[PDB]
Write a protein that binds this DNA or RNA. Structure first.
Ligand SMILES: [Ca+2]
Ligand SMILES: [Ca+2]
Ligand SMILES: [Ca+2]
Lengths: 209, 993, 350
DNA sequence: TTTTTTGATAACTTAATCTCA
DNA sequence: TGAGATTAAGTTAT
């Protein structure tokens, strides 16, 4: 790549060819300015095939300066979003082992970031830098997935336009909310039964820690 | 602020939410008002009296009545009465979202609640009382209660509106322009400040021009400003730099403009300006809040609306400006193929011109009230003020060498090559300009030409704004829908009725709680009637109902709260008993019983009962809409100033639109007016009405001076108060002998064929028949009107037909129009050299069959002679007209591998130029005399939309010839040469249904 | 999204698997909701699951939800809500699948059921006492066990002479043919309808332990078997001219104008049954007319009902007369109209 | 860094399907 | 050896 010099995988084969062309238009200006994630969280989640991660979670905010790339990965538990997710999981199940909850180390779940890079404290501002890349990047995930976990509510309202193929996806309230309207009812187990509706094994969200 | 007129409505999405109001005083100053905003709940006294917080604020809403609207099958006569609860629900405001247990009077978002709780027309002028107003900032007057502050309203006044009609011309090197690699060139503004001072700007970026060119322009009378503060507003051309241009654009946009107008602007223009500004300078367009508390960092958001059985870009500013886009509005009204700037200009700006002087190339034309009717000449001159390309005879475009507007017309001097005749069609069509090549070699003269083109584009956005009456449309939408001016052209029929519906409900004090699982049955039945024969050659009279579906909805009081029950039967041993019970227990003129088609397959009869005692929500909503349309369409007949189109011209159009969707909403599942039985009854009564009209005029004899109707004149539902005498007392001339045969009928239209052939007799007969039908045939609020005389009627299909339209005024010698209702001519599926040939053949057959021979067959021989002249010769491609071969085919969305299975449609490559879902597309698909049929749909894809094609090719030809021959053999009857028409070329036989 | 959506998805999953035992009509609407909220789901909008104790010969049916037949979509009514009277073995005791009931001469019997283990099924059968298939936990093993009804096998874990129809219950006559002096198990009319066997002719019928078993033909059957023996479903039925006797027998009340009304009023359950069902349906059930044929006959007629009473019925379409069953039923239509008039008068008086 | 979406159908048109092989 | 009956959907018009 001309800007920030790929090692393409067999899984993301029909994407990278157009992805580099889409990127080169923005990389001349976005890369020069500083961004909250390190200039590495672009192609790290590309290695290995995606033939068994049938549940993909996506988020629009790649955290403040203490970014991590894939969503919900900071090993500090101080994040408001991670803490509420872990509290809901503990309420549903009751696991006492606390070492930092993360939705990445699962044999059948892959985490994804809606906007790969964003500036320090600048959320929803990069609606034009990553807008074209996002559609193509989400197309491949849509091609083979069981359910997509969208959090953000009206933040993720415009998702059918980027949805090239009809798939099962759910848009949920973000943990920030307005009146803590996330712990009242989240219905996580729906995805846990959705895989069952597609003749696929259900996933208990306690594999690996 | 004393008397100030509202311009826009909006609210702030901050930590504390405030609802603002931008207004203009009689002077040229902007006055902002601010109010607190809360969530509204109308729960009862027993759900909020028991809660953690006490009522923060409550109002005396009054004793509200709630009626549970539901539909349930009843295999009996035992139907329980509808449960109505009268209580003391309180209008409650809470500054935070609370999940209440009751949750009554839902499906109203936030804003109509405010507008009706306080009382404000979103468009209008008010005397903002200074008793409450507080100078919270520089010019922002914030007061607490928006209820007594608008106690008195006054008639509106012509404020000095401020417009920014802006259009930018960029570098179209080879693909669609992008904010990342294509520099801006020719931003043009039709700046109209608050002084009546139109200022045309065509600011050229100076990074492309050289020193000699800019020096020559300065010598010609131009500027080379280097700062924002030194720019002069009174100039007409500037030679600024890119960064300075972006700063000027930001300064203009941040200003409290009444309107910022573009064409394809929110998607392309305004987004391009913004993204370029943050990309180059790093500055952001900070739209300060009216009280200077919230910065938005302008970003245009995308709104998606899709039907189970459309993306629009919108502005997010919160300072009162009403940023607008014309592309989305244009692709919303009526139905036409003109969805492009050049195409819309060609379809909108036209006139007639007489060649008063010829020359080697200069052919002087003249336009005034002498050539055209009126108005079009003035509009032609206005566009010619900056326009420099005029299309004549639909195929010749000449650069305007010299122009002169004396007082009412133009003196355009074109470059025509000594055209014949005297009268030509002068229209502002597309231009012969090649933008990519023009930008390829950029010089001073081409820079000035492009500046002229871009300022013409901005002025053309202004002219389209004036022609469509968009400001009138936006004001009418604000007044009708009870919505902010920024949201009038982005809400479908489901939500636009909520405002007026909420006002009607609050005036009637009814909540209408809807329980779950109301109705789930698929749809209601319908029918289409085939015509009598495929050839008439005589006058056919067209009668049309006046908004039949809303009229029946108000006639039957078809509302869910008025629904009594749907009595259904599965056999005939019980059907007779329950039918007699329904007849004896429900008197006719208080309960209407409709024999709808059975909802379940195992049922033979279904009767839906509607209580016509208290008016429902639908029969009152559409009644209000009809009254408003009637009242707001008579003012343009009385107003003589610009208001005739500035104010009192789009109110009636919007009210017509809203009335014309009540029936569609009445059958839509998740809608506030859903009623399955009401939709069934409406469709059934409409079909009964069309049947009643058809089988009363099927065989009516105009003997002497009276017409004998076919069947008896009886009400098709119950015992009405009308006479049943089928003979009438019309006042035609006594020497008339004609027979009427009801041939075809669509939802609200009936065609009756007549023996006469001359236009005038048919017109007078039809007019007096129409004036007699409403007096005798129709009843109550059912009115009919005579549309036009359709002579030379040819029912090409069950619904498609071609005629010669003759209204009640166009008599005999008047030039006719071939107004049709779905034939080849009107449908976009047809292409070049297809409509003219069938037009000529049908016109010939008109007089071939008017006299009456029943044996003349020379039409086929003449058609063969006409076609053989060019049928063989056209096989050479010879740069075929791609511009008129295709149809309304857009980039479709529902497909498996390719919509209408073909090579690369939907899926496709290189299609940057205006290619997206919802865009009308034009394209084209050494072997002359092609053999066999090869399923000719070979090259059908979505590629770069151009207006050029290759040559020296012998490509096969499409359905043009086959469809022409098929229509012709449908016109005739003999199949002596039917196989030989295409057996040599393709090989087939016409269907001849 | 919410708890309601979770419950809806859970019940969608539950009914998706148990579809061959029907719920299926509502299942399509369940897919419609799923195809909208999630834009698609894993599913798209009458026999026993393979699986697999002697066979109790008769008409077998299966029920698991709360009665379809494995052979075809044959779901009929049940006497005095036996299924609900037995509560719900499926829900109360999880593990059993498609509980099977067999009807033999208007008597409902339960055959072997597939679980878990058969021990719990046997315990449930002992708890709710209707009948037992056998105690195994074709003339051996099953022959040792004796019962009042024929049994042949699921698992263990000739020449005819004349025709003679039998009699079981009220206006019920099971088919029967005498062979060279035994009765052939031809109680199912359809098997006799699909295979018409001429009398005094050799027929390929096989006997295991006790008995042997295997429009134009229907005309021969109706002419040979007592002429006036129509088809009322799985069995035959005579015209059975009667008045209040049939009404009293079907309602299980004492034989009785005001006496019948007083008898109905005395019993609350019979009064609820009377004022809980339509007159036409209860009259058809009382006379035993088949639902399919009678609906067609009624639809193809031109009744002149006045004051909820038939005066002069008549036929319009002769095509429905092709079926011999409708011909015989139309012959005794006077009894039906008289009983319908009596029922309407009784309900009006009540 | 927070509330928000959409009218049902009735039918002519070209489409090869493929085999008589 | 040409004659037909749904698809596979759209496809325009009240
Ligand atoms: Ca433009
Ligand atoms: Ca433009
Ligand atoms: Ca009308």
């Amino acid at each position: 790549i001309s800007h920030a010099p790929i090692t393409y995988h067999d899984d993301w084969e029909p994407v990278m060819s157009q992805l580099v062309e889409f990127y080169n238009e923005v990389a001349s200006w976005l890369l020069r300015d500083e961004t909250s994630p390190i200039p590495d969280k672009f192609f790290i989640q590309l290695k290995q095939p995606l033939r068994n991660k049938r549940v993909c979670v996506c988020g629009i905010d790649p955290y403040p300066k203490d970014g991590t790339g894939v969503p919900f990965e900071s090993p500090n538990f101080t994040k408001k979003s991670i803490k509420e997710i872990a509290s809901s999981i503990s309420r549903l199940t009751g696991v006492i082992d606390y070492k930092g909850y993360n939705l990445n180390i699962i044999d059948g779940v892959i985490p994804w970031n809606y906007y790969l890079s964003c500036k320090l404290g600048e959320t929803k501002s990069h609606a034009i830098y990553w807008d074209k890349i996002s559609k193509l990047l989400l197309q491949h995930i849509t091609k083979h997935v069981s359910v997509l976990y969208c959090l953000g509510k009206t933040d993720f309202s415009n998702i059918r336009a980027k949805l090239e193929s009809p798939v099962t996806t759910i848009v949920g309230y973000h943990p920030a909310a307005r009146d803590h309207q996330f712990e009242k009812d989240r219905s996580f187990e729906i995805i846990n039964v959705l895989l069952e509706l597609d003749n696929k094994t259900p996933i208990n969200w306690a594999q690996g820690f | 602020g004393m008397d100030v007129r509202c311009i826009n409505w909006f609210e702030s999405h901050g930590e504390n939410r405030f609802l603002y109001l931008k207004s203009r005083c009689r002077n040229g100053e902007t006055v902002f008002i601010r109010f607190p905003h809360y969530f509204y709940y109308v729960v009862t006294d027993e759900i909020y009296q028991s809660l953690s917080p006490p009522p923060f604020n409550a109002r005396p809403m009054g004793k509200m009545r709630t009626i549970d609207i539901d539909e349930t099958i009843s295999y009996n006569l035992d139907i329980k009465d509808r449960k109505c609860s009268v209580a003391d629900m309180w209008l409650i405001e809470e500054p935070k979202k609370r999940s209440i247990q009751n949750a009554t009077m839902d499906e109203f978002f936030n804003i109509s609640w405010f507008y009706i709780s306080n009382g404000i027309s979103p468009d209008g002028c008010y005397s903002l009382d200074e008793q409450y107003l507080t100078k919270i900032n520089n010019g922002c007057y914030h007061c607490d209660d928006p209820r007594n502050c608008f106690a008195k309203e006054i008639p509106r006044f012509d404020i000095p509106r401020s417009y920014l009609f802006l259009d930018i011309e960029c570098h179209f090197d080879k693909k669609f322009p992008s904010v990342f690699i294509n520099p801006i060139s020719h931003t043009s503004y039709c700046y109209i400040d608050l002084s009546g001072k139109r200022l045309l700007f065509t600011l050229i970026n100076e990074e492309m021009l050289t020193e000699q060119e800019i020096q020559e322009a300065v010598d010609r009378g131009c500027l080379r400003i280097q700062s924002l503060m030194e720019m002069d507003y009174e100039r007409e051309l500037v030679l600024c730099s890119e960064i300075v241009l972006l700063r000027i654009a930001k300064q203009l946009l941040e200003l409290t403009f009444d309107y910022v107008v573009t064409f394809n602007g929110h998607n392309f223009d305004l987004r391009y300006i913004t993204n370029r500004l943050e990309l180059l300078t790093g500055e952001k367009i900070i739209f300060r809040s009216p009280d200077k508390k919230e910065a938005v960092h302008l970003c245009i958001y995308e709104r998606n609306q899709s039907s189970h059985k459309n993306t629009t870009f919108h502005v997010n500013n919160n300072n009162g400006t009403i940023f607008f886009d014309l592309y989305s509005f244009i692709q919303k009204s009526e139905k036409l193929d003109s969805y492009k700037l050049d195409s819309i200009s060609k379809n909108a700006f036209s006139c007639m011109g007489k060649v008063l002087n010829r020359g080697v190339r200069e052919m002087t034309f003249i336009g005034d009230d002498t050539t055209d009717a009126k108005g079009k000449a003035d509009t032609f001159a206005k566009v010619l003020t900056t326009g420099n390309y005029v299309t004549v005879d639909e195929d010749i475009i000449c650069k305007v060498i010299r122009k002169d507007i004396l007082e009412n017309g133009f003196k355009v001097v074109l470059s025509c090559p000594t055209l014949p005749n005297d009268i030509y069609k002068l229209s502002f069509g597309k231009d012969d300009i090649d933008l990519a090549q023009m930008y390829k070699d950029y010089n001073l003269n081409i820079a000035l030409d492009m500046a002229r083109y871009c300022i013409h584009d901005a002025c053309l956005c202004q002219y389209l704004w004036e022609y469509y009456g968009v400001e009138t449309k936006t004001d009418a939408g604000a007044a009708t829908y009870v919505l902010p001016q920024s949201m009038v052209f982005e809400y479908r029929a489901s939500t636009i009725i909520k405002g007026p519906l909420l006002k009607l409900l609050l005036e009637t004090k009814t909540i209408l709680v809807r329980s779950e699982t109301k109705q789930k049955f698929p749809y209601e039945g319908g029918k289409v009637f085939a015509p009598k024969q495929k050839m008439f050659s005589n006058n056919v009279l067209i009668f049309d109902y006046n908004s039949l579906y809303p009229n029946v909805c108000i006639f039957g009081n078809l509302s869910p709260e008025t629904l009594v029950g749907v009595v259904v039967s599965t056999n005939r041993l019980e059907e007779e008993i329950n039918n007699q019970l329904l007849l004896q227990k429900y008197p006719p003129p208080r309960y209407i019983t409709v024999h709808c088609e059975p909802r379940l397959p195992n049922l033979i009869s279904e009767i839906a009962i509607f209580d016509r005692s208290i008016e429902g929500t639908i029969p009152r909503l559409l009644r209000t809409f009809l009254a408003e349309r009637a009242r707001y369409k008579k003012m343009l007949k009385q107003a003589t100033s610009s208001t005739e189109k500035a104010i009192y011209d789009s109110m009636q159009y919007t009210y017509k639109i809203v009335a014309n969707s009540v029936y569609g909403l009445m059958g839509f599942r998740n809608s506030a007016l859903y009623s399955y039985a009401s939709a069934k009854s409406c469709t059934s009564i409409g079909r009964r009405m069309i049947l009643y009209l058809e089988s009363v005029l099927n065989g009516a004899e105009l003997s002497n001076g009276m017409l004998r109707f076919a069947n008896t004149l009886s009400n098709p539902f119950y015992m009405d108060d009308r006479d049943i005498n089928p003979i009438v007392k019309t006042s035609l001339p006594i020497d008339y002998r004609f027979r009427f045969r009801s041939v075809y009928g669509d939802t609200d239209s009936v065609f009756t064929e007549i023996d006469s052939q001359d236009v005038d007799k048919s017109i007078e007969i039809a007019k007096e028949l129409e004036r007699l039908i409403n007096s005798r045939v129709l009843f109550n609020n059912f009115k009919i009107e005579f549309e036009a005389v359709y002579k030379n009627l040819i029912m090409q299909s069950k619904k498609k037909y071609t005629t010669m339209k003759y209204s009640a005024s166009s008599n005999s010698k008047s030039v006719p129009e071939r107004i049709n209702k779905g034939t080849s001519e009107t449908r976009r599926d047809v292409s070049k050299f297809h409509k003219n040939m069938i037009k000529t053949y049908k016109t010939r057959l008109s007089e071939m069959l008017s006299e009456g021979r029943m044996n003349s067959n020379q039409v086929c021989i003449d058609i063969l002679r006409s076609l053989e002249t060019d049928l063989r010769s056209e096989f050479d491609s010879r740069s075929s007209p791609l511009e008129l071969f295709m149809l309304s085919r857009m980039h479709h969305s529902n497909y498996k591998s390719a919509d209408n299975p073909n090579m690369y449609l939907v899926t496709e490559k290189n299609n940057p130029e205006t290619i997206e879902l919802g865009e009308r597309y034009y394209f084209a698909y050494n072997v002359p005399w092609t053999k066999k049929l090869v399923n000719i749909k070979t090259y059908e894809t979505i590629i770069d939309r151009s207006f050029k094609l290759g040559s020296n090719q012998r490509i096969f030809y499409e359905v043009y010839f086959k469809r022409l021959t098929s229509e012709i053999v449908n016109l005739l009857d003999n199949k002596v040469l039917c196989i030989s028409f295409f057996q040599r070329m393709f090989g087939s036989r016409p269907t001849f249904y | 999204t919410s708890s309601a959506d979770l419950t809806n998805l859970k019940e969608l999953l539950s009914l998706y698997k148990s579809l061959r035992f029907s719920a299926i009509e509502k299942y399509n609407s369940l897919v419609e909701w799923g195809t909208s909220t999630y834009w698609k789901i894993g599913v798209q909008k009458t026999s026993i699951s393979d699986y697999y104790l002697p066979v109790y010969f008769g008409s077998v049916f299966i029920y698991s939800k709360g009665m379809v037949e494995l052979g075809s979509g044959n779901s009929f009514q049940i006497p005095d809500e036996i299924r609900s009277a037995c509560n719900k073995v499926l829900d109360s005791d999880n593990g059993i699948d498609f509980l099977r009931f067999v009807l033999l001469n208007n008597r409902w019997i339960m055959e072997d059921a597939i679980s878990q283990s058969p021990v719990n099924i046997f315990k449930l059968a002992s708890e709710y006492g209707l009948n037992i298939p056998n105690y195994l936990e074709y003339s051996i093993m099953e022959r040792s066990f004796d019962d009042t009804f024929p049994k042949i096998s699921i698992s263990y874990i000739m020449y005819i002479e004349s025709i003679k129809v039998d009699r079981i219950g009220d206006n019920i006559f099971i088919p029967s043919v005498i062979t060279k002096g035994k009765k052939i198990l031809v109680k199912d009319v359809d098997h006799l309808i699909r295979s018409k066997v001429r009398e005094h002719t050799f027929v390929k019928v096989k006997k295991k332990n006790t008995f042997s078993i295997l429009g134009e033909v229907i005309k021969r059957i109706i002419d040979t078997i007592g002429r006036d023996y129509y088809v009322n479903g799985k069995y035959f039925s005579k015209v059975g001219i009667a008045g209040l006797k049939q009404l009293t027998n079907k309602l299980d009340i004492n034989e009785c104008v005001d006496e019948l009304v007083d008898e109905i009023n005395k019993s609350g359950t019979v009064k609820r049954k009377i004022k809980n069902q339509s007159v036409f349906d209860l009259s058809r059930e009382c006379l035993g007319y088949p639902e399919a044929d009678f609906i067609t006959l009624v639809n193809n007629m031109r009744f002149k009902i006045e004051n909820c009473k038939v005066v002069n019925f008549n036929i319009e379409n002769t095509n429905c007369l092709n079926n011999p069953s409708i011909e015989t039923i139309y012959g005794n239509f006077n009894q039906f109209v008289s009983i319908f008039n009596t029922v309407t008068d009784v309900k009006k008086r009540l």
